[PDB]
Amino acid sequence: MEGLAGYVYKAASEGKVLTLAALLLNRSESDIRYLLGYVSQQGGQRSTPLIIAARNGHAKVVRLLLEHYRVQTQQTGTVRFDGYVIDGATALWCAAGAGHFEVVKLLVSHGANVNHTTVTNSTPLRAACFDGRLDIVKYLVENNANISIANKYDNTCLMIAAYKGHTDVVRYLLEQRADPNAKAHCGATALHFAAEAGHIDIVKELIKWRAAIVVNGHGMTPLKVAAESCKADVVELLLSHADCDRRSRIEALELLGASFANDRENYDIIKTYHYLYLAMLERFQDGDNILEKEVLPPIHAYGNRTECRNPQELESIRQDRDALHMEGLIVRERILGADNIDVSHPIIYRGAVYADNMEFEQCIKLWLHALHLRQKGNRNTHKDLLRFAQVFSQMIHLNETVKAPDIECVLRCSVLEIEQSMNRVKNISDADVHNAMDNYECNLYTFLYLVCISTKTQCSEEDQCKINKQIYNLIHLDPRTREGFTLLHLAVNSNTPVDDFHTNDVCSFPNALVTKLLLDCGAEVNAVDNEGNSALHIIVQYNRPISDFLTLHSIIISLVEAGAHTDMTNKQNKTPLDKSTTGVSEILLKTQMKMSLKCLAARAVRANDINYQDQIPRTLEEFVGFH
């Protein structure tokens, strides 16, 4: 009776009480249980009629199903989407997540589990305060809901309520003796979440609740997180707590000024200068107990300026934006230790802004520093390399000679990132294997664009030697796209995508120079993908054999003269002449096909299926497999 169950589920979802009563009319107890309780699949969601009625907030449907049909309020199903595949949630959890007070009241009166636990230990009170309704939270609390119940990451209801900008629910939770010193998975408390959320009222309620400030698992105070969030008012209220001593408050002021120095939406010279002036005055005022900051040695990526120790040094650079940005970056990475998550992103934004107006080299060195920091942080940088190859593509399009040591260092960063993605996809399971493979393919394509722009530049002998050495390293790493495409297959394939930015103007595939450089660096010319096509089957299907015949002929001769087997047979018994679809490529390859008795004998052996196992040299066995 799946059709009747589906009809009842649809009636409950749409709220049609008349249809639900008509479909439930004259039904036995077994039929009632089957129609009310069955899990139905719709829109990627597994839900029962009562669950789907509570999710849509149908009070009439819930009261009709619970007053007479006495359906048990312990149904299981999958609720919501967009990162929430929570299973086992009852109707109360759906009603609390969608902010429906009447449904929660009806379920509680009928006997729903107030302290129900889902798969990730999600209390319905947590969803109720997640939505932002005070009445539901109050009703659940008065109906014996345990706030202290948390998930596997130890996120209490106070934290999930403090993520959003709802003052009333967090205030009521604080009034109900919520623990403020609860620790999340990475040593985090609700104070960090309130600080990053930028709500002054939640932070002041927490500090009036004696939040017991403590650093996170990474090692930053919640005041530091508030400073990183470019929230001036959040930072300028904890000075009255009388527990930050003097070093913590001055370092928070410096961090807030640093965050003011570079932000996509919170960038302003005057406020940053004022805050840095306040920090400098507060640091240099006492004198006897002056707090001396430990200045790092000058990083070449951090310009040639080593901090601003003198007050007049800061006063004189008030009219320069770049020095302010540099000192903000230096103090930010000094306070955060240059190992935090949100260190590199302001550097990348500052580089992008610096590059938007034809200024290149300082952008390049800041991006290098950000790449180094993210590599030390074990963070993928596919987007960084992509935008950076875009920047060089724009440079080459504007006939600007790109500095070559930058290309060397960026290529070494690219091969390091590709190796990191390689062992990542080696260790990452099926949970995010698709995303890991997509990042891997993006890294491969970015390296190809970098090789193309390197071939479009002119460098020295030793510089070209180092670049080819790095390409040799990556070739010996032997990358493999999800379709088995080696490094050589992509360089000759016209199906390799190029992003919509200026890379289309320069990095156009197939490229003769890229393939020649790969073959000079010992690329596996006879490499076979999982499809079966070699590096020669892929090119000969090129659909533009005449307009750019030069970059087809050059790649064909470069492949053939190095190691290519012209007669190599793929998994579908297709010679490269067979997979040509072009007279130009077919006869151009035929001009390179040196006929050999070995190939004819291999074809004759394969065609009639002679058992060649152990009766020929082993190198001939794979040679027969070639044909």
Binding site: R264, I348, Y349, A352, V353, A355, D356, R387, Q390, F501
Partner: peptide, 7 residues
């Protein structure tokens, strides 16, 4: 423009 697509 590099600022627009930074996201």
């Amino acid at each position: 423009k590099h600022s627009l697509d930074l996201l």
